[PDB]
Amino acid sequence: WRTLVGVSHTNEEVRNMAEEFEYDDEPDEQGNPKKRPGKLSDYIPGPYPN
Amino acid sequence: KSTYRTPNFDDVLKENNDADKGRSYAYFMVGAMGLLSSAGAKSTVETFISSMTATADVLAMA
Numbered sequence: 001w002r003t004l005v006g007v008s009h010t011n012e013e014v015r016n017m018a019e020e021f022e023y024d025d026e027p028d029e030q031g032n033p034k035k036r037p038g039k040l041s042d043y044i045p046g047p048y049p050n
Numbered sequence: 051k052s053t054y055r056t057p058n059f060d061d062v063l064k065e066n067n068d069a070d071k072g073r074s075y076a077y078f079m080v081g082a083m084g085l086l087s088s089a090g091a092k093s094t095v096e097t098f099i100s101s102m103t104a105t106a107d108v109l110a111m112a
């Protein structure tokens with residue numbers, strides 16, 4: 001996501017685009033998995049799981 | 051014929067020798083080559099050395 005900044009979109013435009021997808025997070029203190037919205041370090045996600 | 055007779059060198063000799071002008075133009079071209087070769091070798095080493103600094107994905111987690 002970070003590679004689009006300064007090429008086609010501004011910095012706050014890409015932050016809003018990546019925040020419409022959810023990614024895997026580290027598990028909580030009991031060990032159950034969580035989710036989180038996206039950030040500029042993430043890669044653009046695809047439509048299929050496998 | 052006699053070895054004291056020097057053969058004809060006139061189609062390559064300058065009309066005025068003028069030793070201060072012939073040494074000055076040859077040392078301008080050799081000096082310009084060492085100037086550009088040193089600036090070229092310096093940027094070459096800095097291209098290879100800077101490839102060992104932190105990559106773009108490492109800096110994004112700073």
Ligand SMILES: CCCCCCCCCCCCCCC(=O)O[C@H](COC(=O)CCCCCCCCCCCC)COP(=O)(O)O
Binds near residue numbers: 087
């Ligand atoms: C292994 C086969 C040879 C491949 C060629 C490798 C070239 C690297 C050797 C450098 C050649 C010049 C030697 C300089 C020298 O000691 O002459 C010095 C003279 O140096 C000077 O007076 C001015 C410096 C010359 C600048 C030449 C720029 C060339 C920069 C190299 C370009 C990148 C490779 C002694 O030579 P002389 O006895 O004729 O005076």
Ligand SMILES: CCCCCCCCCCCCCCC(=O)O[C@H](COC(=O)CCCCCCCCCCCC)COP(=O)(O)O
Binds near residue numbers: 090091093094095097
């Ligand atoms: C060992 C590598 C030798 C490369 C052979 C030349 C092939 C051309 C590719 C050059 C890629 C690296 C430079 C890229 C670059 O951005 O540089 C450019 C252009 O400058 C040059 O490097 C051209 C000179 C090439 C060397 C001339 C002889 C120097 C003596 C030998 C050097 C060994 C110590 C500088 O731009 P920059 O400073 O913004 O990075």
